[PDB]
Structure 1
């Protein structure tokens, strides 16, 4: 029968997930919601015609014996608390980024999870479920190119609003590269360095954009990540892995080609939300399927959330200092292997 899901936080992202589970995916139902604004949570229940109980807070929601699993989609700084509560209630949890606002916060979650003795926590890094990244991973695991030596990647966005700050380039943007790369090559980060090219005319005065982030893994892989969030031409994710004997590269999103007015061309997406639409569906379906069939979650773990937190911290530190900063990671427990 259905995985009974409770949703913590019914803003934009919560609603997207509620719609996804209710109208797109298989094997789950939203049976409980809670939001800080009780009125909005009730509106979401009518909007999506749910047979769902509205709770005033996450504690009461998690005490519902008929809730099997929860989605944490609230205000970012509020995530860690709900994730901890869900773990103590021994219920599966899918948490949108971030897992916690600090490495210490991530560690707290890690510790409680290791206690429980099974995987409850899945973090919403959806790139691992994208078909392009799955293909790169399969090629690497089959040794198509030999040992990875270097990674060249770019995260580009047409324009950002006035609220977007320099730190957000790593904390909100490069965080996705940070999660997916160590997964692809199975190696931990060791150091980071940030280099600023001349500033783009497309960037607001307070914002350092573009940026280059150079990351070295413990095994000696060197990653050059370009971040340019005011590139104007489109939203563009590029990733090239250079191995000893060959090179693999992420594909462009599928597009018909056009020959017109002296150009041969394909489309470039303009909206970041459209780049990984398929991956959001697959990641939640995997959450549901893995729980139903295996009794624990797969996909990005609480430890992956910890790695992201420590690495983003080091990047923001390197943004400020201009020197090479250490990424200091605890040893990966056997629990997460």
Structure 2
């Protein structure tokens, strides 16, 4: 019957996932809430009419035996702590990115989970659940294009706020590409390099934008990723995989077409929140269903969180040094193989 879920962190995306579980998905219910702000957390149970005790902290909510699983949706740097705790409490955990702000912290989560002996942790890299990326994965697995040789991608955003900084280009933005690409081609990153084109007029003086990130896999796949967060025209994810015998490419989001005033056109999304809305529903549903059927989670793993953490670090180092940097990856544990 219903999977009982506690929510750690009721900001925007905590409110979204709650709405999801309460009003859209099957098999689960929100029974507990927290942080930080005792208020607001109470305002959230109000807003959504929840049968939910407002606990004052992780351990508190995590103490409850009427909670089977948790969503960690709080401030990024807070994640590692709550995840560790929930693992010790042996509850299933869905953790929004990042798993932890350091590779060391991801490694600690990895260590703990391996002790429990089964997969409790799923990281919220929703792109793997998007129908376009699923199709790309299927085509590759069915050897449609032969071996992958190169990947060209772009992650574009119309404009960012004052506080968006150069490192966020890789840490908050490219991390999605970083997680999804190694999954697609099943190969590990080896080296990264960052090249800066002239700065766009739309970027604030403190921010280096756009940038080009070149990544090589151990297999020798070269990825060039454009990141351009002040592109003005829209929010835009583009991904092209070049293989030996052919090329596959991610599709545009669905739009009606329009002939009008001398132009034939389709819409480009302006809002990042509309790009992957279905994927978010799918990943949470899969969280719920995996548990109810397999006694463990199925999505991106604690190791995937670690791979991202390490890769983003090398990228930031590449941003600073302007040189080709190594990606320091431990061999993958048997437990995640």
Class of the TM-score when normalised by the shorter of the 2 chains: over 0.9
Distance in 1 between the 2:157 and 2:36 partners? 32
Shift of 1:43: 1.1
Deviation string, structure 1 residues 65-117 (Cα, Å, up to 9, x no partner): 11000000011100000000000111100000100010000000000001111
Alignment correspondent of 2:208: 208
1:152 match: secondary structure? strand
Alignment of 1:73-222 (within 5 A): 73-222=73-222
Per-residue deviation at 1:267? Answer: 0.6
Shift of 1:37: 1.0
SS at structure 2 position matched to 1:38 = coil
After superposition, the C-alpha distances for 1:244-291 in whole angstroms (9 at most, x for unaligned) are 011000000000111111111111000111110110000000000010
Q: CA deviation at 1:6?
A: 0.3
Structure 1 CA distance for aligned equivalents of residues 57 and 16 of structure 2: 20
Give the TM-score normalised by structure 2: 0.99
Q: Secondary structure of 2:39's partner? A: helix
Distance 1:245 1:282 in 2: 32
Alignment pair present for 1:269 and 2:265: no
CA drift of 1:151 comes to: 0.1
Residue deviations 1:198-237 (CA, integer Å, cap 9, x gap): 1111111111000000000010000000000011111000
Structure 2: segments with no counterpart, 5+ residues: none
CA deviation after TM superposition for structure 1 residue 46, in Å: 1.1
* Structure 2 SS opposite 1:242: strand
Q: Match of 1:265, SS?
A: strand
Q: Distance in 1 between matches of 2:258 and 2:11?
A: 39
Unaligned runs of 5+ in 1: none
Return the offset for 1:12. 1.1
Q: CA deviation at 1:320?
A: 0.4
1:54 to partner: Cα distance = 1.0
95-104 or 35-44: bigger deviation: 35-44
Q: CA deviation at 1:60?
A: 1.4
Q: Deviations over 1:162-184 (max 9, x none)?
A: 11111000001000000000000
Deviation at 1:331, TM superposition (A): 0.9
Q: Offset at 1:39?
A: 1.2
Q: CA deviation at 1:51?
A: 0.4
Q: CA–CA distance in 2 between the matches of 1:49 and 1:89?
A: 27
Secondary structure at the residue paired with 2:43? helix
Judge which range, 324-333 or 34-43, deviates more. Answer: 34-43
How far apart, in 1, do the equivalents of 2:39 and 2:227 lie?
Answer: 39
3-state DSSP of counterpart to 2:10: coil
CA RMSD in angstroms comes to 0.6
- Distance in 1 of aligned mates of 2:109 and 2:19: 28
Quote how far apart the aligned CAs of 1:63 are.
Answer: 1.2
Instruction: Give the superposition deviation at 1:11.
Output: 1.1
SS of residue paired to 2:214: strand
Q: TM-score, normalised by structure 1?
A: 0.99
